[PDB]
Ligand binder design. Structure first.
Ligand SMILES: Cc1cc2nc3c(=O)[nH]c(=O)nc-3n(C[C@H](O)[C@H](O)[C@H](O)COP(=O)(O)O)c2cc1C
Ligand code: SF4
Ligand code: SF4
Ligand code: SF4
Ligand code: FES
Ligand code: FES
Ligand SMILES: [K+]
Lengths: 87, 263, 213, 429, 43
């Protein structure tokens, strides 16, 4: 439930092939950017960084949970379905 | 027009009537620690981890349940608040089993992490611990109920979201147990979601069992294709292998749930 | 002792149970005591009624109460395992319940427990081989000024001495039903050796009534 | 006045405390119950609530909230839901047994109180929750209710007043926690006896999700007398803010353990000696008293010498009046074992809902068990003090408070006994 | 007038269904119950 890893904007690159090393079965790669993750305060900073480096990019709007209406009293409603059957 | 003014550590914030103390805190970017509270379930107020001091009020209040009053100043880092959290965390861990190495929740466990951030760093419990027998509820969800902290999230989810009233608590006091009483399988198209919401390793994915640790997984945000709902998902991979499927929150589609077929 | 059920040949969804016609009329009166739309309020009295007819609650008895009131079986299971008066295993014809909380402990309830155990030859929490008596300890039964005391089924037996309780048991074996109450000479909760109050005839209607009423 | 006690029998409310007169309707009426009840109902809730406020009556269920102000929460215009009075006859506090005597010997006081109290609250019916072990008592109450119905005293057009009122009796099934006001409501609704958080308060959302007041049996049963004889009459007994008469239970190590009615603010010493025949083995043989039932902290003999029996007097002694159940322990008592057994009781009554009491009370119980044998170290005593403070004030209901307070009383006044026991275990090992 | 006898002796003759029989007998005297407006919260 912690939300502290949803504060900042991330830039990552497209996933490329990983294959099994014949000797040990370890995961091999030829992608030099496979582990590259960049952090940004705003999407505008991230977009700016991508543009000057010439990378084609996609931007996904931040999803924030919508404010909910919580009422503990509703658990015991006289005439509504919110009444809970157990605690 | 209808908003009322409250203070969070002395910072003015304007909230709707009925807003809880916990909700007021998240408006200034503070997250009150929680176990039983879940924003998509009915309020429970039983874990007590969310207790918080109100300035000039002698008694700490359950933030998840207490509506805020006008002019209240919520003290989310005072000594009274911090000591309430430490005491509650001490009670949660007293009987909790020493399972982290063998428990699949380790590394992505709210009990572990909130113990690190809000709990004490040692134990003064000198007795034996409670031990509970396991309940079989089907091939998807493994139960290790000694880890259960009686938060009742699974009970509330099954009743309210899934519309299945087969989970509950039996017994009383320290011996109270979550389960079905009788031998019953909890098979619902939405059943696997109780793994996500169980804060601890009491309910875990049987298919996922033992295969990975959270820190080593790469997270790929993607879309479910097992139906036409388009549920947003995260594909967890490690070293080129798909390890599991998790919900990705989307308020207008699947919220934070996925079906068993998707999962 | 356990709060999980396992089917056994004696206790399973097919164990026969149903209310008699007379208990269905009693159930109708119970349900009518609560607002319409809130029939789950009858779970405790109807579940207790299932026990008074049957002596204990098999799982099928719990399933029948859930069905009659249209509540999920799990919700009835929660009640049956929460409240200590429900018997989820068969008990003897006489459920002896010895209070052992501090007020009764201070007036030697331990001597009562010991005499019952010697008399019936059982330990706490066991049934006699004849299936006549089950013995358990319980918390304060709300008769503390009459300690030490026991409850046998619905009756209280009070101000007991080790001889008095064996006399109650000897009567129970013989088929006689002993009279409830103190076995020390007093009738209820008055001080022994003489009333210290309420010795004058009580006043009649209208005494000390304020003016204007 | 500055001295209290010596309550006259003409001033005793529960004139059939000992069941030596007919408890049924004819006996009750001959003693003054049900008299001019129509006139009281026609005076209206505000007048009835006014008498209760002037009386200084405080809650007799253990918490002692002012009754007149509490009942006034219900005196609001109807929002469409029915309103109810729930009468708490759970009577579960160890040492307490006064409500048992009212229910079986003066049931018509309780029924009339339900009508008078329900009228002041605007209720349509009273639910009397009675513990299931009180089966015979509940049966007597039920016979009295039938008598009251057949005489027209309750039901449609109660007492001829034009007010409709019903009196239901619903039995419990074995749970101390169901005496807690919101657990009691949850039990009437058919759930486990787990308390609710507040808010909402029962006066807004109570039984069946409706406006509700929970009142103790003794609290309700005195309301008709206060209205007939006047709140001024009731306020004339006891200290200011400690008004009225009180039912006491004296149990434990006394010569004649009994239930009695006596003036509020009577000295504890005077109460034990006048009515219970004194302490077994003499007054000097006294070790400690639990003044207000198992949930209240014990006080030692030195404190008992002069303490008054009322809410404010016992708070200053670092305890409380509670239910006014007096458990006396003489000098032959293992005071550690006595308190340990109370902690065991709380371990068995915890509903298990909330973490501090579900885990903490069972934890306190294991520590107290070792304190009885001395199998501990003195550093654990302060550890136990801190544990009890992490439960008190942090739980959903007051049962967690009621478990922490007995431990704090024991550590407060008997630390050397605890430490001596640990020292003895250290030698024998 | 007499104080020397116990006058609550009727419950020596109560039985298993005494309480529930009284409640059944009281049914005819009760006012009609209020209604939440639906069969149950699950309707
Ligand atoms: C564990 C627990 C048990 C209680 N048991 C009773 C009881 O048996 N009878 C009672 O009147 N109040 C009991 N109470 C107090 C009630 O919660 C409540 O304060 C009382 O019914 C209010 O009525 P009053 O103001 O007339 O006293 C209990 C409280 C707790 C926390
Ligand atoms: S649930 Fe969390 S704290 Fe408990 S054993 Fe598993 S990882 Fe450790
Ligand atoms: S199994 Fe998990 S979700 Fe369910 S009550 Fe226990 S800790 Fe909470
Ligand atoms: S304090 Fe104890 S009895 Fe009260 S709600 Fe919490 S667990 Fe239940
Ligand atoms: S999060 Fe508030 S009590 Fe559990
Ligand atoms: S302590 Fe035994 S009846 Fe109260
Ligand atoms: K989990």
């Amino acid at each position: 439930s912690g939300v502290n890893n949803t504060k900042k904007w991330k830039m990552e690159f497209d996933t490329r092939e990983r294959w099994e090393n014949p000797l040990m079965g370890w995961a091999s790669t030829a992608d030099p950017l496979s582990n590259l993750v960049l952090t940004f305060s705003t999407k505008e900073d991230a977009v700016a960084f991508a543009e000057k480096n010439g990378w084609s990019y996609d931007v996904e709007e931040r999803k924030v949970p919508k404010p909910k209406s919580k009422s503990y009293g509703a658990n015991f409603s006289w005439n509504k379905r919110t009444r809970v059957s157990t605690k | 027009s209808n908003l009322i003014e409250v203070f969070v550590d002395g910072q003015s914030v304007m909230v709707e009537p009925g807003t809880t103390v916990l909700q007021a805190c998240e408006k200034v970017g503070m997250q009150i620690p929680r176990f039983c509270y879940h924003e998509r379930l009915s309020v429970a107020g039983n874990c007590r981890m969310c207790l918080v001091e109100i300035e000039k009020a002698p008694k700490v209040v359950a933030a998840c349940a207490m509506p805020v009053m006008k002019g209240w100043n919520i003290l989310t880092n005072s000594e009274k608040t911090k000591k309430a959290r430490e005491g509650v965390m001490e009670f949660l861990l007293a009987n909790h089993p020493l399972d982290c190495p063998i428990c699949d929740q380790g590394g992505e466990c709210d009990l572990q992490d909130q113990s690190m951030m809000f709990g004490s760093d040692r134990s003064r419990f000198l007795e034996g611990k409670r031990a509970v027998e396991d309940k079989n509820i089907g091939p998807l969800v493994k139960t290790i109920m000694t880890r259960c902290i009686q938060c009742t999230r699974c009970i509330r989810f099954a009743s309210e979201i899934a519309g299945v009233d087969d989970l509950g608590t039996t017994g009383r006091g320290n011996d109270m147990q979550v389960g079905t009483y009788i031998e019953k399988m909890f098979m619902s198209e939405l059943s696997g979601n109780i793994i996500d919401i169980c804060p601890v390793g009491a309910l875990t994915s049987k298919p996922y069992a033992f295969t990975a640790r959270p820190w080593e997984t790469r997270k790929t945000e993607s879309i479910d294709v097992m139906d036409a709902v388009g549920s947003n998902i995260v594909v967890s991979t490690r070293t080129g292998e798909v390890m599991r499927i998790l919900p990705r929150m989307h308020e207008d589609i699947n919220e934070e749930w996925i079906s068993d077929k998707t999962r | 002792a356990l709060f999980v059920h396992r089917d056994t040949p004696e206790n399973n969804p097919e164990t026969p149970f149903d209310f008699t016609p007379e208990n269905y009329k009693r159930i109708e009166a119970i349900v009518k005591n609560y607002p319409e739309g809130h029939k789950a309020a009858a779970v405790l009295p109807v579940l207790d009624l299932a026990q008074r007819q049957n002596g204990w609650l098999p799982i099928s008895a719990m399933n029948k109460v859930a069905e009659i009131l249209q509540v999920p079986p799990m919700r009835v299971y929660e009640v049956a395992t929460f409240y200590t008066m429900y018997n989820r295993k068969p008990v003897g014809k006489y459920h002896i319940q010895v209070c052992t909380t501090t007020p009764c402990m201070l007036r030697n309830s331990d001597s009562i427990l010991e005499a019952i155990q010697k008399k019936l030859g059982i330990k706490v929490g066991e049934t006699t081989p004849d299936k006549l008596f089950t013995l358990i300890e319980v918390e304060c039964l709300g008769a503390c000024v009459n300690a030490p005391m026991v409850q046998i089924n619905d009756n209280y037996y009070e101000d007991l001495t080790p001889k008095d309780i064996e006399e109650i048991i000897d009567e129970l074996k013989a088929g006689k039903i002993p009279k409830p109450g103190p076995r020390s000479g007093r009738f209820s909760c008055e001080p022994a050796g003489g009333l210290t109050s309420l010795t004058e005839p009580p006043k009649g209607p209208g005494f000390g009534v304020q003016a204007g009423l | 006045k500055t001295s209290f006690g010596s309550l006259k029998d003409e001033d005793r409310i529960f004139t059939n405390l000992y069941g030596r007169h007919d408890w049924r309707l004819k006996g009750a009426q001959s003693r003054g119950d049900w008299y001019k009840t129509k006139e009281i109902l026609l005076k209206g809730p505000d007048w009835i609530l006014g008498e209760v406020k002037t009386s200084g009556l405080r809650g007799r269920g253990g918490a002692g909230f002012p009754t007149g102000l509490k009942w006034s929460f219900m005196n609001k215009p109807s929002d469409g839901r029915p309103k109810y009075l729930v009468v708490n006859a759970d009577e579960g506090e160890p040492g307490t047994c006064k409500d048992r005597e009212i229910i079986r010997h003066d049931p018509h006081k309780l029924v009339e109180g339900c009508l008078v109290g329900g009228r002041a609250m605007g209720a349509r019916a009273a639910y009397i929750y009675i513990r299931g072990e009180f089966y015979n008592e509940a049966s007597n109450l039920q016979v009295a209710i039938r008598e009251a119905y057949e005489a027209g005293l309750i039901g449609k057009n109660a007492c001829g007043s034009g007010y409709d009122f019903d009196v239901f009796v619903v039995r419990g099934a074995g749970a101390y926690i169901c005496g807690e006001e919101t657990a009691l409501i949850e039990s009437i609704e058919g759930k486990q006896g787990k308390p609710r958080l507040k808010p909402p308060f029962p006066a807004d959302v109570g039984v069946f999700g409706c406006p509700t007041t929970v009142a103790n049996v003794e609290t309700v049963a005195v309301s008709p007398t206060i209205c007939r004889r006047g709140g001024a009459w009731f306020a004339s007994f006891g200290r200011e803010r400690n008004s009225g008469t009180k039912l006491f239970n004296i149990s434990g190590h006394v010569n004649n353990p009994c239930t009695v009615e006596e003036e509020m603010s009577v000295p504890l010493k005077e109460l034990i000696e006048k009515h219970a025949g004194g302490v077994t083995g003499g007054w000097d043989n006294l070790l400690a008293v639990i003044p207000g039932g198992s949930s209240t902290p014990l006080i030692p003999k030195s404190v008992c010498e002069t303490v008054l029996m009322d809410f404010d007097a016992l708070i200053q002694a670092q305890t409380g009046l509670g239910t006014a159940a007096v458990i006396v322990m003489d000098r032959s008592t293992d005071i550690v074992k006595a308190i340990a057994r109370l902690i065991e009781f709380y371990k068995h009554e915890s509903c298990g809902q909330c973490t501090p009491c579900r885990e903490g009370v069972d934890w306190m119980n294991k520590v107290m068990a070792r304190f009885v044998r001395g199998d501990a170290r003195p550093a654990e005593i302060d550890s136990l003090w801190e544990i009890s403070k992490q439960i008190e004030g942090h739980t959903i209901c007051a049962l967690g408070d009621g478990a922490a307070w007995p431990v704090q009383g024991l550590i407060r006044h008997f630390r050397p006994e605890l430490e001596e026991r640990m020292q003895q275990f250290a030698q024998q090992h | 007038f007499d104080n020397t006898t116990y006058k609550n002796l009727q419950h020596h003759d109560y039985s298993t269904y005494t309480f529930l029989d009284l409640n059944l007998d009281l049914s005819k005297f009760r006012m009609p119950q209020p209604s939440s407006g639906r069969e149950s919260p699950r309707h």
